[PDB]
């Protein structure tokens, strides 16, 4: 019949019921591949993941796959089916599957021109996705055109929940730079700053990043990170007011600003010559330094420029909102794997 087949080296045995693999990305330890259901009638995305010798590791799994069963939501990926071994011992790894979408908005920002009807598209699907993300009292922490993936007729939905964890505002303060490895640039200045990302202006801050960049067609964050980054974006946005500095209630970080050359205001619009105004205003107001005079969702969403696609009565929101103690490590790798089997029980025949 069917048996583990073979990719690049790695063992993805994930058949009879899915065939036709094909690579997708590295990954790490976690690999992707294409492959097809049998049973029903659909191309569909797998990911075979490995962690358990890891809390760390153990940590990303279980958040994605919580999350994302907990989750129901047109813009928001949908877990498929889960393959895994009937037993704990004999569980080595995670095979997760999702409808198979076509390409992700950071490939097209890259090779593709974003019309003004397909750039509000988007960004209008994104915060629908986003407002239900936040009403569940979730924030995603890691938004980005890479975890943005798009099908052939343009539905948009959010996909890696790695990150993510249960808001949390009154445990946001963490003293001056002391890392969080993410790997990007669509982070919030102030995570580098005094807060460990655990309010919803985190994921605003992205989403007006992703807007910014599908205004300019391409990505506005290459090069230069940590505190070069914040420079170059203080060098567009302007120095923090000192209203500004009273939010920032640490020593360290606000005179770390106070060091800084004075850098004038750069309006987007001298920025980006043929623009919709509607859309620079939302702009400005989603990427505002200071968190707390940072947009909303709900705001965003009722912004005049997504007038054609806003409809609150067709914007859900959670239905089963959440706010757990597993937060932040402090939990074994046994103890972890525990609690992934029994989030993954519900897909095992019965
Ligand atoms: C978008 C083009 C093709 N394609 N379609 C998907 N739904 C898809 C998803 C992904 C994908 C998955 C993932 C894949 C299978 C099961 C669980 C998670 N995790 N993940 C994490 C970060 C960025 C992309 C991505 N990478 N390529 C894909």
């Known amino acids: ?21 094909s690579y997708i990305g590295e990954g790490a330890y976690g690999m992707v591949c294409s492959a097809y259901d049998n049973v029903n009638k659909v191309r ?123 808001a949390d505002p009154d445990h946001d303060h963490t003293g001056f730079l002391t890392e969080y490895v993410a790997t990007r640039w ?59 500095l009273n939010c920032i209630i640490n020593l360290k970080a606000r005179n770390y600003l106070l060091s800084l050359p004075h850098k004038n205001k750069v309006p987007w619009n001298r920025l980006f010559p043929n623009a919709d105004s509607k859309a620079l205003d939302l702009l400005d107001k989603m990427l505002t330094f200071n968190p707390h005079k940072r947009i909303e969702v709900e705001q965003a969403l009722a912004h005049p420029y997504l007038e054609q696609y806003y409809d609150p009565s067709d914007e859900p929101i959670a239905e089963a909102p959440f706010k757990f103690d597993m937060e932040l490590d402090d939990l074994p790798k046994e103890k972890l794997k525990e609690l992934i089997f029994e989030e993954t029980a519900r897909f095992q025949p019965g």
Request: proline share 4%.
């Open 1 to 21: 019949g069917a048996g583990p087949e073979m990719v690049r080296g790695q063992v993805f045995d994930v058949g009879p019921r899915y065939t036709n693999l």
């Open 44 to 166: 569909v995305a797998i990911k075979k993941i490995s962690p358990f010798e890891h809390q760390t590791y153990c940590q990303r799994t279980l958040r994605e796959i919580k999350i994302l069963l907990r989750f129901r939501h047109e813009n928001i990926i949908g877990i498929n089916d889960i393959i895994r071994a009937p037993t704990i011992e004999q569980m080595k790894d995670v095979y997760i599957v999702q409808d198979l979408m076509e390409t992700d908005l950071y490939k097209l920002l890259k090779t593709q021109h974003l019309s003004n009807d397909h750039i509000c598209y988007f960004l209008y699907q994104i915060l629908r996705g986003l407002k239900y993300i936040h009403s569940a009292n979730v924030l995603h922490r890691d938004l980005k055109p890479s975890n943005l993936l798009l099908n052939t007729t343009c539905d948009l939905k959010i996909c890696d929940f790695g990150l993510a964890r249960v």
């Open 186 to 244: 669509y982070r919030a200045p102030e995570i580098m700053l005094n807060s460990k990302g655990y309010t919803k202006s985190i994921d605003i801050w992205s989403v007006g990043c992703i807007l910014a960049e599908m205004l300019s067609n391409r990505p506005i964050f290459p090069g230069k990170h940590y505190l070069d980054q914040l420079n170059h974006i203080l060098g567009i946005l302007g120095s923090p007011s000192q209203e500004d």
